[PDB]
Amino acid sequence: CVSNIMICNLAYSGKLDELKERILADKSLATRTDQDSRTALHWACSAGHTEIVEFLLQLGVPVNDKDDAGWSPLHIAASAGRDEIVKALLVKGAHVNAVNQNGCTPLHYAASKNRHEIAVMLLEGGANPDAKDHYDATAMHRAAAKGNLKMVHILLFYKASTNIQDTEGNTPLHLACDEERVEEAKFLVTQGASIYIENKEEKTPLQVAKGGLGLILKRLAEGEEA
Amino acid sequence: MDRRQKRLIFSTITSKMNLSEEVDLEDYVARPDKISGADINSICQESGMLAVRENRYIVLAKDFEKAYKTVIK
């Protein structure tokens, strides 16, 4: 079991029928909270049981309450890659720019785990592409760091900035270079990522790059500035 | 340490743990604190502990958050 409240365990376990009989037998169970300040909605979202989520939504339960970790149903759904559930939540007005305890919005996780469709759904629904977490990290930082090249492209289409700096002074380009995401890096400079911004270590994306990647980028940049 | 190595240790150690699907280790990987493999090891162990102390067989984001705070000063 994952919860101290029976209804929450049934939601995670996906027991739709028993869950419905018990909620209709006592409507309060639909919003009862557990030790993590979670309701059947959170757990159903985590497990990805679309059916249970739809049943709960048509029941009119709240869709924006956060658990004790600051996670809302949308954060969970997005990070867990439950495309269907994320679309349904958005319809019911899920807050697309809500942040959890570390300052992240659903888009952060979607971009991080390279979830294209969920990312698009979120951006089309008004997510701020430049949303910064408590460490001033954006969705693009997490994508660029891991080499999520297509994700970066998606973020760009929605006017994402390429030069926002995190608490260590790094821009998505920095991260890309540090982790040697070669193709990503060239692409970034190609779209205006600055090769001149210094991080807290006084290094530029050029001085962070390895294997002569810096020469390449400097050439791309200078040519893109000409 | 190197950013990729930091990620590797996290994913290596948790590969043998039951993490809820919404958890994203990149949340801790991406932080500025200079921790060591031992710290990473402690963070994961405490997280498992925190999950058990709640009779939960799946590890949550809240577990890693406390654990992180508990190990890094």
Partners of A75 on chain B (C-beta within 8 Å) are 22
Resolution (A): 2.4
Answer yes or no: are the C-beta atoms of A34 and A5 closer than 8 Å.
yes
* DSSP designation for B59: B
State the burial class of residue A17 (Cβ atoms within 10 Å of its Cβ: 0-12, 13-18, 19+). Answer: exposed
- Contact call for A36 and B60, based on CB within 8 A: yes
A132 touches chain B (CB under 8 A): no
- CA nearest to A175 within chain B: B3
A21 and B CB contact within 8 Å: no
CATH class, B1-73 region: mainly alpha
Q: Do B20 and A46 touch (CB under 8 A)?
A: yes
Residue in A13, A79, A99, A201 to test binding to B, most B beta-carbons within 10 Å: A79
Of A102, A178, A179, the CB nearest to B27: A102
| Closest CA in chain A for residue B57 | A2
Distance CA A9, CA A223 (A): 58
Q: How far apart are the first and last CA of chain A?
A: 62
Q: Of the candidates A2, A47, A137, which has its C-beta nearest B56's C-beta?
A: A2
Residues of A in contact with B11 (CB under 8 A): none
Name the experimental technique: X-ray
Instruction: Please list the residues that pair with B19 across neighbouring strands.
Output: B59
Query: At which residue do the structure tokens 């919404």 appear?
Result: B22
- Chain B residues in contact with A34 by the CB 8 A cut-off are none
- State the Rg of chain B over Cα: 11
Please report, as a single letter, which amino acid is at residue A174: H
Residue A133 CB: number of other CB atoms within 10 A? 22
Instruction: Give me A58's structure tokens.
Output: 């048509």
Phi-psi category of residue B33: left, alpha or beta, with phi > 0 → left and psi -120 to 50 → alpha = beta
Burial of A171 (0-12, 13-18, 19+ CB in 10 A): buried
Q: CB of B31 within 8 Å of any CB in chain A?
A: yes
Angle at A177 between CA A171 and CA A181, to 5 degrees: 115
Q: Which two tokens stand for residue A23?
A: 């909620």
Cβ of B57 under 8 Å from any chain A Cβ? yes
CA A157 from chain centre, in angstroms, equals 17
The dihedral built from the CA positions of residue A144, A148, A153 and A156, taken in this order, carries a sign that is negative
Domain coordinates of chain B in residue numbers? 1-73
Determine the 3-state secondary structure of B19 from DSSP.
strand
Domains along chain A with CATH numbers:
1-226 (1.25.40.20)
Q: Does A35 touch chain B (CB under 8 A)?
A: yes
Judge whether A38 and A67 are in contact, CB under 8 Å. yes
